[PDB]
Amino acid sequence: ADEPAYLTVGTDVSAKYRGAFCEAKIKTVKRLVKVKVLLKQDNTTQLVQDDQVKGPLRVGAIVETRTSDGSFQEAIISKLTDASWYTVVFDDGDERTLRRTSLCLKGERHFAESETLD
């Protein structure tokens, strides 16, 4: 898991702050997906990661997910929202979990201003 699972660990990146760039260094890589599940019984929808969701990651698939009750109920995927936690260490020595969207990798200006979700 502490491997190039999406991107790579140890890599220096820039993270967006309020439309500006800050440098950071990838401490941990977490490849997770935010599965929008909807419980078949309680009809409640939630958006939780594939660690909470036991089963295939397919929209319209039947899985079991951890409800806020701590129980695992059989649910259906209604969406999978991409996610990744790059725990990046900023020059301050602080490391915070940033979703890939905040990571600019090198820092070329197609972030901060530009971003078409591509």
Domains along the sequence of the chain with CATH? 1-118 (2.30.30.140)
Please report the DSSP string for 31-60 in residue order: EEEEEEEEETTT--EEEEETTTEES---TT
Amino acid code (one letter) for 6: Y
Residue 54 bridge partners (DSSP): 64
Task: Output phi, psi for 57, to 5 deg.
Answer: -95, 85
Residues with Cβ within 8 Å of 81's Cβ and at least 6 positions away in sequence, in order, are 33, 34, 35, 36, 47
Paired tokens of 14? 């820039």
User: What CA–CA distance (Å, rounded) separates 67 from 74?
Assistant: 10
Work out the angle at residue 1's Cα, subtended by the Cα atoms of residues 73 and 45, and round it to the nearest 5 degrees: 25
- This structure was determined by NMR
User: What CA–CA distance (Å, rounded) separates 67 from 96?
Assistant: 26
CB atoms under 10 Å from CB of 14, counted, come to 20
Paired tokens of 26? 């990838």
Are 98 and 24 within 8 A, CB to CB? Answer: yes
The tally of CA atoms less than 13 A away on the side-chain side of residue 30 is 18
CB atoms under 10 Å from CB of 118, counted, come to 5
Residues with Cβ within 8 Å of 59's Cβ and at least 6 positions away in sequence, in order, are 77, 78, 79, 80
